[PDB]
Structures are given as structure tokens and as C-alpha cells.
């Protein structure tokens, strides 16, 4: 058997106190009034007595929402400590009004002295009523608290190194973290933002960015900070969604401290705000500035207009140069024509790079330093225009914004490759005069290095077209999922690189004694790139290349065979190669497939919002006047606004509050309490 | 009072006789007794050390689920309930001194080692215990999370 | 476990390794059955190393020699056929026994169809399902592993490195 | 603009009728009583008047559960047609009692005549009250209906070809299908099975099997028949789960019309009934008959006992032959020892087949008809024992049950292969005397064919070990998922075979003119199995083999090259081969991966139940005394039960009814109706 006993002493309640608490629970007003009137004369019952569950008479009155029993218990001067917190958490407007309004009148002789009721508090001691009201998100209680001149402490910077923050973190880290989380939860409520901020959209944007940065910093409390940032973003999108006219939307978007607020939302990564349907409609109307009814048309006329405007690339840019104020020069300033002209210019550059690799132009390959062909002479202005455009993009916008795009790394690499190939071509022209045949050239010839860099730059230029997939409505979310899965591929390739380095080290350490010279082997070649596969594990670089090529099956099985009949070493190397093949083809690749599969399922729900955000970021890049000319031609030589914004935000806040007001065992207990209180009063009167 | 369950590897005469005579009644009685012992209210009321009692009951329920093939699911549910009760009791702390008193209590971090020995992943992975372990881990480097990554890598 | 990005990845790797072992039991059984059949069919046509070109005998030659002459060689040849490194002319004998060659080719084709169409895709499906279950709990167990690694260095036993602890 | 009008004429209700219906809706008893008393004298209001939503006064009384207004409307002789159906659907016990009990007394002068109320009925005209009560699943209403001598029509056989069923199907198929579905829904309720069947378990089993067969037959109504079968199976498992003692469980399982009811459940495919934990515990106790406390032991002693009992295979079977009544001979009759002895015998047969393929035994291969070696002489009794065991399994149990296992096809194939190889060996011994060398043998030599069949039989014997995976606790659900994915692989391989046949036909039709002889080609070989790959598309069989081998990449790219310089034909064939490769390696295989992935997710939730069902089917195969000896040794030459079952089913039905009783806007309308009726009565009295 096992004896059981109450380990921790809870004092038993007396018969009178238990009857009084039961009468308060059942809502019988007359019995509670009789007990309260008998309490002073006889001192029989401690009115501030607790229960087994930690509630007092006042808390039981608050939980049942009996305003009559609540005011009756208040009239006999019961203990009132922390009851306002329970009323605020219960979201009872009348209880909060009673507790606010009754604490002032009729206070005489301090309070009656009471001891040992104060240990048990459900609410934390750091909590204050305005902060808990902000956490509850109730509007009326927040309004009534804000009317009584109440303030909230200001949180410090995340990278704060002052004496008091460091001392509070060292003395009690848990209290500091709980206080900061409670303060940010109070500041992130939609009701407090609507009531105590003159700019709710900008305040919600800044609070969402700060909460996201705090979630990035604080590892322990990441989830609730992410939830707070999502709540602020959804509050901003819901406030934007309450508009009723196009003038209100253009007033909200164009308010400054042209579309300044949209740029501020994009800078703070508010994808829900940017991807709202009305803002998308306004951006579509601005995008198709000179082409009304673009969505109406059948696709053949749209494609014919696109072909006729893309084939007209060399005109309409010189027209802008010669007459910007003319009717023809003004058509290039629209964003759609700008994007189509840039796409046509890049397609022309790609087609010219295809045409440069033909035998019609390339002649007399046996020259050491060859002069540039006419195709290269014409391609050179496009490279210079790309260089001028990239340096102009570096200057305008700042160096701190140029690096956040992540497409500029390929542009920097392409420009470096073009500069390197141009320098190699000019040095080969200047000091490599001659006509030596190509079969006896140096391996480190700058002409060959220049051509290799030109080929790599041509590959980068052709792979630059992936960034235009946001313009279409079908290839955007595909590349968004591709971008997430590329990060997952990098996370896989770290472990793959570690395993490859380990197996390459083992194979090279086993096999590097049996290295043979190129003269002894057939055809005077040495490596895995021969007709007969030579020594593949003779060096660390050759071992790494051989282990890389074994994944695609291009490495044969006889590379592990040596000249001598060392059967044990050959068997050990074959076991090594087989273990590496089993790992890299049975565990790792299938695990990568499983990881990118799981990622896609998560990515798909959000795929549209981020696609619309990327398309909005691409659309507003062409809105400005900086960069009107193409790459081939870019190198050729006020308080009424604030008042209207306040009016629109006022109407939006009222509509959002109406919408949120329009949109459990505690509830039924109210109905039992209301029926029980009515039953006792009917029996008492009758 | 409540009867005490026997060991899982019990070979006494009465347990074997009860299993042979009526296995269903014995299994139902053992499951009802362990369900009664795994309630959070009874652990809070009738145990002087609720955390250690919850840890031992969770380990015993997990071992019983490993042994008893027919009744695996409710034993796993009872072990999860005990682990969640331990994590919820740890989560109710309000100060760093209470957390260090709870973690450092012995029969340095003895209770954390006892939780790791009993495989209480929810208790170890609580945010306040993780913050205390991070503070102890970066003992001589204050404000390690604050720094930009270049100075940390340097 | 020390990094914040490579911990749950190796936790999922640890679960999928157990799933890979559960797959590799059935794969080892199927491999042993097909290797037994192939060796029992082909071990009469074993040839010496002197008769074959270059004085080598096995699947590790320039020209692939008798791959089903012994049980060990048959096991190695059936293992290497999964990655495609075993050619198709290993099932050809010196004499013109077309029926035996066709039966051996059918045997090798059936083993290839099993081990490359049923088993590997089933392993992919199993480890995929496992990952979805693993991801929700991936953090808790990563934090548990990091806590176990952190308290290993808390004690004073083992302060010196491996070069200096002796 | 668009005009809108009431297209279909609903007659407007008068002021008095609308006020009367509103008073009945609000539950005011006095106003309704006054209107009813004034109705006869003045004829002002049609008491059977409808509303805009199709309810009458009586239906409004039934829906609000006002028994007083219900009886008051009954006392004035209102229309009562189909109101019992609304009461039964509302599951009101008092309303059903009132409608049953009031229809008999005080019927005078027929009914008062009423016209044109009868068109609108929510319940279908084929419905009857007992059938709708069975659909509702309420117990009290079903009991009250069954007490009044009520019957239900019997459904016909699914394969019924009588005149009346065919005539009803031809005249009105929809009415017949609805009537059959309503009848089977009425018969599948747990309450009706518990109340009107003396054997609820067997009745639930038969109804579940009939509903599953009807779902297999009727394509249109598959889902609700599957739901009814699942409901019957869950009712059977829930009734089995209510047991309280081992004696009740053994009485239920061992009841006959040893474990007869378990065999009946297995025959009807009741996986939930078999996989219940108490039945699994009883089967585990019977399975470990002679080994008490098997689950208790550490795994080393369990594996040591398994090794010592599996290595003792040649004893304990001859002991059963020589002394079945001895203490040693009785240990083989237990099921665990039987399974371990059979597994040891099959492992010994597999090890002997491995040992038969060694050079230690095989000698003198240059004999045309070779005598059988001593290994073959010893292997022959195992093949004869397998033949005798398979034919004994064909005889016992019936030919109709031998074919449903699906493992007997491999046993039939193995026996056919062993018979063919034995016949080929004996014919080669009898009439192929000589010692001709193997290099000049006929291609159709029976020795080579016998060895090929022996190798295929050895493969089948080694692959027979998959069936023992149910015994382990980890390899069972794996092979269950493998069994489902094998069916999905067959569904894939149909489309793959069609695509392979199409591309093979095209490739053979293109390439069969360029066939070359074996003499002209190097090494005197012709096919894809040469060192240099010969003509691969010369014949239909060769084209099929080449297209099969291209999936694994073993077919090179130079097979599409011809001797002459026909560049167009070579390019067309290369395009053909590339299109087949792109299909069979980019679309089909990945689609097969996706299909078997989806299937696994569905399979996993149910994987255990079916694994426990398969393990129970394997365990009871060894319970009987038929087949005690191994394959090497099998060829060596009462009404108290029904009363106890009725008692146990009685207690189980009572416990299940208590459990199901223990385990929306209509509800709140009751509370509004009860509050409104109390408010009117208090105002009327005061
Ligand atoms: C001697 C060696 C010779 C080698 C020769 C061959 C070299 C081949 C190189 C091939 C490179 C291919 C790169 C393909 C990138 C595809 C990216 C698709 C996804 C995508 O849109 O990514 C964007 C970023 O791209 C990026 O950040 C792309 C970065 C590309 C870097 C390339 C250089 C390294 C997202 O856009 P976003 O980052 O704005 O999205 C912010 C969202 N919140
Ligand atoms: C000249 C050509 C020479 C060719 C030489 C090589 C031949 C190689 C042949 C290889 C065959 C491999 C077969 C593997 C089968 C694995 C099955 C795993 C799943 C499984 O347990 O299936 C059981 C049925 O098996 C079955 O039904 C198995 C049927 C096997 C048929 C084999 C012959 C065709 C289920 O059991 P269950 O059906 O009772 O489950 C009832 C549930 N409700
Ligand atoms: C992180 C990555 C590692 C994770 C942990 C390990 C995972 C499993 C690794 C298995 C390695 C097997 C190596 C076998 C070997 O030596 O082969 C070459 C050698 C070549 O001689 O193989 C042999 O000598 C044995 C021939 C039979 C091999 C049977 C293999 C069964 C398992 C197959 C899995 C699928 C392929
Ligand atoms: C557990 C593992 C086993 C599960 C149960 C079985 C699964 C399916 C097994 C299919 C084996 C097919 C063997 C065919 C064969 O003999 O090929 C070699 C031989 C070589 O001569 O093929 C032939 O002789 C026939 C040529 C046409 C083959 C058509 C194959 C259709 C199915 C393809 C599936 C995907 C590949
Ligand atoms: C049901 C199965 C069919 C479903 C419907 C069709 C699916 C897509 C079929 C695509 C067939 C492409 C055939 C290309 C071809 O002729 O190649 C051989 C020939 C060989 O000369 O290829 C060519 O001549 C063109 C060389 C460029 C090929 C580009 C292919 C782009 C698509 C690649 C997909 C992934 C691989
Ligand atoms: C398929 C093979 C032949 C390679 C083709 C390479 C390029 C010629 C393709 C790749 C991406 C294509 C672009 C993808 C998306 C678009 C957006 C499309 O416009 C829209 O989607 C309308 C809405 C809008 O963008 O405002 C106009 C064509 C264009 C620029 C495409 C032009 C042709 C591009 C550059
Ligand atoms: C990518 C190729 C070149 C192979 C590299 C192999 C090694 C040089 C890598 C593999 C794993 C790496 C480790 C992975 C994780 C970490 C933890 C990292 O610290 C943290 O994550 C901070 C938090 C903490 O651990 O307390 C410091 C670097 C280190 C030891 C890394 C050091 C470099 C390692 C040993
Ligand atoms: C891994 C390689 C070497 C191939 C091995 C082939 C066989 C030797 C294996 C394959 C399946 C195995 C069987 C799988 C499962 C079981 C059940 C196992 O018993 C239980 O799981 C206990 C519960 C019960 O079955 O009652 C005893 C061993 C046995 C027969 C195994 C014996 C060894 C077998 C026949
Ligand atoms: Ca750029
Ligand atoms: Ca059989
Ligand atoms: Zn500070
Ligand atoms: Zn005991
Ligand atoms: Zn009929």
C-alpha cells in the first residue's frame, strides 16, 4: 500500500467562512449582506479569507461578474489588492469602472489592518494595470486607463551597454527578460497603437521591425517575438484594408514624414502591407501608365504590341536624347516601356553573344595577339554601359543599400570578368605580336585566359535572365521556392563538403604511392580526363575531382586498380570508394530530396505574398527617372497633406475598431450565476 | 491510501498468480493505479518533491510502455503528461534565484543532471534554463549575443 | 550541436539513419538471394587469370572479367550494379549458350528493377515521411543535445587538450 | 438595372395566422390557447396553416420542445401527418412518447377534412418511423418503437435476378437505390443491433461484410456503404472492449454457433476486432504456451534460448515421432517451438542451397548426364517434404481457401521448378550417357535448362523469407507498406509497359533494315551483351531489351549509329531514343516516387492494425495440430456455452450503451424558448 497525506499545509476554512464563500459563489445577495453586517459586530468571519483555489470573495464576485455583490463587498472595506488586474484580465468593463471609481471615495483611517493575505498573486508582481490591459487587447479598459494619466516605461535599445541594463541583467536576468517581453507585448497591442499613436501605420512598422530584430537576437524568446511582429504586420494590413475610396488610398500611400509610405513599408519588409489588393491595383494602374485596359486584351494583341515595342529598341532612346519634351520622347518615361526596352536590350546583348561564337566572324585563329573583331568592337559599348549603370547604381541609393539586393554580386562578377578579359586582350595586342600556331602556345597564355573569362562572363550574362521571372504570373513563386531550396541545398552541401574532404583525404593517403608519370601511361596523359582513366587518387586535387565525378557515375571502376598485384590494398580502396558511393548516393541525396520537399510544402502557402512583394519591388525600380536610357545609350553624353492623412487614419481606425469588435466554461458560469441570483431574489421578495 | 504497484520485472508468487488467473483484471488494475499516480494534482498534493516524483513516474511509464506491448499508447500519454507537468511547474518561476534554487537542489546543477539522466527533453529545453546555461557557458565573455559577427569570428 | 543551423539537420540525419538501417536489412536479404542465384548459375564458367587479358580477374579490370564466378565476386558485382559501374557484357560467356545467357540477363535485370525502382524509391518515401514527423520536435532535441554538450565541459575533468592531457 | 420578383407563388399568411404562429414560436401558452378556442367558433385561422419556411404550428412546437404547446395543439385536433418523423429526427423522447400515445384516444368522426397541406414533406415518402429512428441512432425511441410490434423489410441479395427487383430497378432505379440504402442504414445502427439481435457480434460481422460487398458492387454509393461497414466494425470492437474479466473474453472468443469467433472475425476481415489489446494479450499468452514471462527477459537470454532451440531442429521431431505422449515429445506441440523449428528448417534448407554452389562438392563438369551429388541426394527429402506439405495444405482447408493466401503462388512456382529440374535431371541421366565437353553442347540441353530452373527456384526459396517479417515488431508495417506500394508499382508498370511497347515498335520499324550478321561483326556476337555494343534495334525482342536496359544507363549512345552515313535517319533515331529516355527518366519514375510517397502517408496511420492482423493470422496457423512436423520430417510414415455467451453479451451491451450515452443553434433556441415560456407564464399569473 501507499499512504497519502497533504504535504503542504493549507489551512482549513471554518464553517462560517465556507458558508459565506458558498453564498458569494451562488450569488445570494441577502445572505452575503447579513454575513457582512454580522461580521463587524461579532468578528466571526474574516472577510478577506481565501479559498482552497486561491480566490477571495472579491475575486469570486469579479469572476462571476456580479456587480451587486462586487459593490456590496466593496462597501464593507474588504481587501482590494490586485483585484483590478483580475478585472482587466476578465475584460469586464463594469468591474474595471467600479474598481477605478470606488478606490477614491470614502477612505477613512488608512485601510483596516490585514496580514498574510498577500502572498498568493496570480499576476506577476512586475505587472501594472495598463500593461495587463494592453496585453488583454480590450479597448474600453485601455481607454479608461489612458484617460487617467497613465504611462508605460520605455524599453532600451537591444544593443544597450549602459550600467543599469547590465546590472539588471547580471542581478536578475529572468525578471529583466519578463519585463521587456511584457513591455513589448503591451506596446504591440492594436488598441494601444490606435489610441496612443498619431501615426499607427509607421508605429506598427517600426514595432514590427524591432520585434523581428529582437527575435533574431533573443534566442530563448523567439516565438512570441515572431508572433508580436506578425500581429503588428496584420494590424497594419487590416488598417490599410479598411479604406473606402481611391483618394484615401493615395493619401495614405503618398504621405511623407512619390509613394513614400510604400517605400517605407518595403524597407521594413512589410509583405502583407505591400501585397494588399488595393495597393496592387494602384501599382498596376501606375505600371500601365500609357496602356489603358491592358488586362482586357486578348493575348495575341498584347504579344504583338510587346514584339513591336521590343523590336523598336534602337529608336525611342535616341528620341529621348534629342527631344525629351516631344510626344515621342515622353513614351519612354513610362515604366512598362522602360522594362520592355531594358528586356529588349538584354535580349539583343544575349543574341549578340550567341552571334560572336560563330565561324562567320571568327577568322585567322593562329595569331598570338589578335585584334578585336567588329562584333567585339560593337559589344564593347554594351559592356561600358553596363559598367556605367552599375557604378551609377552604386552611387545613387548608397553603398549600404547596394549590397542588400543580392543580385549585384553577379553583376560585380560579370563586370570583373569583362574588365579582366578586356585587359588580357589589350595586353596580348600590345606585347604579344606574332602568328605562332595554337598547338605550341604556353599554358598560361593571356589569350586563353581571356577567352575562358569571356566564356564564364557569357554564362553569367545568360543566367542573369532568371531575375526577370517576377514579371510573369507563373514563374515568380517557382523561383521563390527555388530561392528557399537553394539555401537548403547550401545547408546540405556543407555536410557533403565535409564528407567529400574526409573520403578524399583517406583515398589520397592510401593511393598516392602508386603515382605514375605521363610518359609511361598511354597517350601521354595523366588524370581522369583520358580515354583510358589514369591514376585518379594520386594527388589531393585529383582525388577530390575523382570523388566529385563519381556522384554522376562518370568515374569507372578500374581506377582503384594498381599495377602490382596488391590485392589487399585494392580491396581496401574499393571498400572505401564503395562506402563513399553508398553515402553520397543513398543517404545524402535522398535526405536532400526530403528536405527540399518539406520546404516546398511550407513555401507554397506564402508563395504568392512574396511573389507580389518581389514584383512590387521590381515595378518601383522603374518608376524613378534615374536610368531611363538603356545600357547601350546610358553612356551617351504643406500641412494639408498631414491633415488629410490624419483624417484618413482617423476614419480607418474607427472602421478597424468596428471590424475587430464585430469579429468556454466561464461563459455558462455567468448564466448559472445570473439564473441563481435571480432565483434567490425572487424567493427573497416572495 | 492507494496500493503500490510492483516492479515491472516482478517474479513473486502473488503477481504471477494474479497474471495467470486473470491477466485482464491485473492489467486494468495496474493501468488504473498508474493513471491515478500520474495526475498532476495528486503529485502536487501528496509528494514533497513533485519534480523528482514526476521524473521517476515518467521514466517508469516509458519503461512500462516499452515492456507492455498492448497498452503502449496510454503509457506514452501518461509519460508525456508527467513531462509536461514537470515543464509547467518549472515554467511558473518568477525570479532567477528561484530557478537557481530549483536547479541546484540536491537529494553543481544536480537536478539538471537528473533530468538529463531521465531524458526529460521538455524540462531541459525550457527557455529560462537555456538562458541560465547560456550565462554559465559564456562565463568570461559578457554580451556575446550582442556582438556583430565579425568581432565574434575574430 | 554547437551551431544553431546544423543541429536539427543531424538530428533528422540520425532518425533517417535508423530508417536506412531498416531498409538495408531487406536490401541485404534481396542482395543475398540474387547473389546466390547468380553464383549458382554462373560458377561453372570461371576462367583463370592467365587466359584472360592483362593477367587480372574480377570486376576491377579495364575489360570487366567474370563477375559471377564466386560468391564474394557475385556479391561485389551485384553491389556495384546499383551505381551503374557494372557493364552489361559480364553476363556473356565464352561459349554460345544463349539460353543460359538470357536467363542470367533476366536475373540481373530483375535485380536491377527491384533495387532501382522499388527499394530506393521506398527508402526515399520512408525518410521523407520521417522528416515531416521529425521537424516539429527538431528544436527541443537539438536544445537537449546542445545542453548535453555544454555540461560536458562544465566539470574540471579534462581541462587540458589531447596534446597536453598526458 | 435588374427587376426582381417572386417567381414561384408562396401564398402570404394572414394577420391572425401570422400572429398565431409568432405566439406559438414565442411559447406564449395563453395567447395560443385563446386563439385555438376562438378558432372553432369563428373559423378565422386555419390551425394547419404553414409558414414561409415550410413548418406548421405542430412542427414549430416540436422543434422548440414545448411539450405543453405540443399537447395543446394536439387537443384541438390539428393535422399530425409526418410529425412523428420530425420528433424522431429531433431525438425528443417526450415528443415521441406524446405522438405515439395521443394518436389512439379520442378519435371521433374520422379526422376533420383538410386539403393542400400535404405536398411539402422534408422526410422522403418512402421513409417509415422505425427506419428513421434507426438512422437517428437514438436508443429510447428505437425501444419504444420496437415495443409496439414494428417490422422492417428484408433487403434482397446483391446478385438478385428475380422479377420484382428487376422491375423496380427498371421502373425507378433512384427509388430502389434510396430504399436499399435507407434499409441498410437502419440495419447498421448499433442500437438496433443491440436491441433486436441475439448475437450482436456475428450480426455486426455479417452486416459489415455485406456492406463492404455492396460498396464494391454499387459504384455510385460507395462512400456511405464504406462508412456503414466502418460503423459496424467499430461497434463490434467497442462491444468487445467493454469486457471486464478474462473469463468473459474467453467465453466470447470461444463461443461456437478452439477460438471459433476469432476465426470468424478473421474470415470476415475484422481487423479492429482482431487487433484489440485484450485479444492480443490472450493470443500472446496462448502463443508463449510453454515459456512464461517471455516479455520480461533481457534480450541476450531470449536470443540464447532461440539459438539453442533453433540449433536443436533434428531432435524434438523424431522424438514426437517415437514418443508423442512423452515429456520431450510434448514440447513440440507448442506454437512458438513449432514456428522456431520451421524457421530453423527453412534456414537449414537455405544454407544447404548455399553449400550446393561450392567447388568442394561439384566435380567433373564435363559429363553430359551427371549423376546427382550427395548434396542433391540430401536436398531431395526437403523438396519432397515441401511437396507433401503444400498438397496437404491444398487438401485441408479447401481449394477455395488455398488461393486467398497469395503466398501459395510462389510455393506452386517453386514446386513446379523443382519438379521440372528433377525431371530434366532424371531424363538427362537416363538417356544422355556420355562425357562430351561443355563447350560444344546443344543450346537446348536439358542439363542447362534444369540448372537454370534450379537457380530460379533457389532465388524463389531465398526470397520466401519475406513472409516471416510479421513475427518481428519492426519489419511488419514495413512490408505492409511494401505490399501497398507494390500494387502502386503495378499501376505504374502498366503505363510504362504501354510506353515501352510504343517506343520499341517505332525503333524496330526504323532500324530493322540495317541488321547485320554475326560473322561480319567483331567477335562473332550479335546483341547488346557484347564488349562492343552491336545492333540494338534490329528485332522487336532486341529493341525491347535495349529499351529496357536504357533505363539503368547500361546501353551506350553509339547503338543508334549505322554503317552508312545516313545522318537524317541517325538523327531521327537519336531523337526517338532521347524522347524515350526523357519520358522514362523524368516523368514516369518521378511520378511513381510521388505516388508511392502519397500512399505511404495514408498507409502509416493504419500500419499497426494490419500488422497485428497479419501477426494474428500467422500465429493461429501454428495453433492447430495439422503440420506439427517440419518439412524434412512430415513425410516420414452443450447449451451452457450459449447461455454464458448470452450473459456476457448482455453485460457487454449494457456497458456499451452506458459508454455511448456517456460519450449548435437548435440548443440555444431551447433556452430562449424555456426562458420565453417562463416569462409569459410569470406575467400571466402576476
Ligand atoms: C573557375 C570556375 C568557373 C566556373 C564557371 C561556371 C560558373 C557557374 C555559376 C552559376 C551560378 C548560378 C546562380 C543561379 C542563381 C539563381 C537564384 C534563384 C533564386 C533567386 O531569385 O535568388 C535571388 C538572389 O540571388 C542571388 O543572390 C544570386 C547570387 C549569385 C552569385 C553568383 C556568383 C557566386 C533572390 O533575390 P533577393 O535576394 O532579392 O530575395 C530577397 C527575398 N527576401
Ligand atoms: C525466365 C524468367 C526468370 C526470372 C528469374 C527471376 C525471378 C524473380 C522473381 C522475384 C519475385 C519477388 C516477389 C517479392 C514479393 C514481396 C511481397 C511483399 C509484400 C507482401 O507481404 O505481400 C504478400 C503477398 O505476396 C504475394 O502475393 C507475392 C506473390 C509472388 C509471386 C511470384 C511469382 C509471380 C501479402 O500477403 P497477403 O496477400 O496475405 O496480404 C493480405 C492483406 N489483406
Ligand atoms: C553520414 C554518412 C554515414 C552514415 C552512417 C553509415 C551509413 C551506411 C554506410 C554503408 C556502407 C557500406 C559499404 C559496403 C562496401 O564496403 O562496399 C564496397 C565493397 C567492395 O569490395 O563491398 C564488399 O566488399 C562487400 C560486398 C557486399 C556489400 C553489401 C552492402 C549492403 C548494404 C548496401 C547499401 C546500399 C548500397
Ligand atoms: C521485393 C522485391 C520484388 C517485388 C515484386 C516484384 C516487382 C517487379 C519486378 C519486375 C521484374 C521485371 C524483370 C524484367 C526482365 O526480365 O528484364 C530483363 C530481361 C532481359 O532479357 O528482359 C526481357 O527479357 C524482357 C524485355 C522487356 C521487359 C519489360 C519490363 C516491364 C517492366 C519494367 C519495370 C521498370 C524497369
Ligand atoms: C506520357 C509521356 C509523355 C508526356 C508528354 C511529353 C513530355 C515531354 C517530352 C520531351 C521530349 C524531349 C525530346 C528531346 C530530344 O529529341 O532529344 C534528343 C535529341 C537528340 O538529337 O535532341 C535534340 O536534337 C535537341 C537538343 C536539345 C534538347 C532540349 C531538350 C529540352 C527539354 C529537356 C527535358 C529534360 C531532359
Ligand atoms: C525558352 C527558351 C527559348 C529560353 C528563352 C529565354 C528568354 C528569351 C526568356 C526567359 C525569360 C523570359 C521573360 C519572362 C517573363 C516576361 C514577362 C512578360 O510580361 C508579363 O509577364 C506581363 C506582366 C508584366 O510583367 O508587367 C513579357 C516577356 C518576358 C520579359 C519574357 C521574355 C523572354 C525571356 C527573357
Ligand atoms: C566546409 C569545409 C571546408 C569543411 C570544414 C570542416 C571543419 C573546418 C568545420 C566542420 C564543422 C565546423 C564547426 C561547426 C560549428 C562550430 C560552432 C561555432 O560556434 C557557434 O556555433 C557558437 C555557439 C556555441 O557553440 O557556443 C564555432 C565554429 C565551429 C566549431 C565550426 C568550426 C569548423 C568546423 C569544425
Ligand atoms: C541480414 C542478412 C544476413 C540476411 C538474413 C536472412 C535471415 C537469416 C533472416 C531474415 C528474416 C529473419 C527473421 C525475422 C524475424 C524473426 C522473428 C524473431 O522473433 C520475434 O520477433 C519474436 C516475437 C515472435 O515472433 O513471436 C526471431 C528471428 C526471426 C525468425 C528472424 C530469423 C532470421 C531471418 C530469417
Ligand atoms: Ca544591379
Ligand atoms: Ca503455403
Ligand atoms: Zn540600458
Ligand atoms: Zn509482485
Ligand atoms: Zn429480388
Residue numbers in the entry:
A (entry chain D), D (entry chain B): 17 to 273, 286 to 665, 706 to 731, 739 to 761
B (entry chain A): 167 to 273, 286 to 332
C (entry chain A): 498 to 663
Give the exact sentences the study uses for this entry:
Like many other TRP channels, TRPC5 is permeable to Ca2+, with little selectivity among monovalent cations, and functions as a thermosensing channel. Here, we present structures of the human TRPC5-Gαi3 protein complexes using cryo-electron microscopy (cryo-EM) and demonstrate that Gαi3 can directly activate TRPC5, increasing its sensitivity to phosphatidylinositol 4,5-bisphosphate (PIP2) using electrophysiology. Remarkably, Gαi3 binds to the ankyrin repeat edge of TRPC5 ~ 50 Å away from the cell membrane. Electrophysiological analysis shows that Gαi3 increases the sensitivity of TRPC5 to phosphatidylinositol 4,5-bisphosphate (PIP2), thereby rendering TRPC5 more easily opened in the cell membrane, where the concentration of PIP2 is physiologically regulated.
Even after extensive 3D classifications and particle sorting according to the numbers of bound Gαi3 proteins, the four molecules of Gαi3 from the fully occupied TRPC5-Gαi3 complex (hereafter, TRPC5Class1-Gαi3) showed lower local resolution. Moreover, when we performed 3D variability analysis of fully occupied TRPC5-Gαi3, we observed substantial movement of Gαi3 proteins and cytosolic domains of TRPC5, showing structural heterogeneity. Therefore, to deal with this structural heterogeneity of the TRPC5Class1-Gαi3 complex, we performed focused 3D classification and sorted out approximately 30% of the TRPC5-Gαi3 particles with different conformations in the TRPC5 region (hereafter, TRPC5Class2-Gαi3) from TRPC5Class1-Gαi3. In contrast, we observed substantial structural changes in the cytosolic domains, including the CCD and the ARD, when TRPC5Class2-Gαi3 was superimposed with TRPC5Class1-Gαi3. First, when viewed at the bottom of the channel, the CCD was rotated by 45° in a counterclockwise direction in TRPC5Class1-Gαi3. This rotation was accompanied by the ordering and shortening of the loop between the CH and the CCD and the rotation of the connecting helix for 5°, thereby elongating the length of the CCD by a single helical turn and moving the CCD downward for 5 Å away from the membrane. Second, the ARD was also rotated by 8° in the same direction along with the CCD. Third, the ARD was stretched out from the symmetry axis by 4 Å, losing its interaction with the CCD. Fourth, we could newly observe a strong metal-like density surrounded by four His735 residues at the top of the CCD, which may have contributed to the stabilization of the rotated CCD. Finally, despite all the differences mentioned above, Gαi3 was bound to both conformations of TRPC5 with different relative locations; that is, Gαi3 in the TRPC5Class2-Gαi3 complex showed a slightly longer distance (~4 Å) from the membrane and was located closer to the symmetry axis.
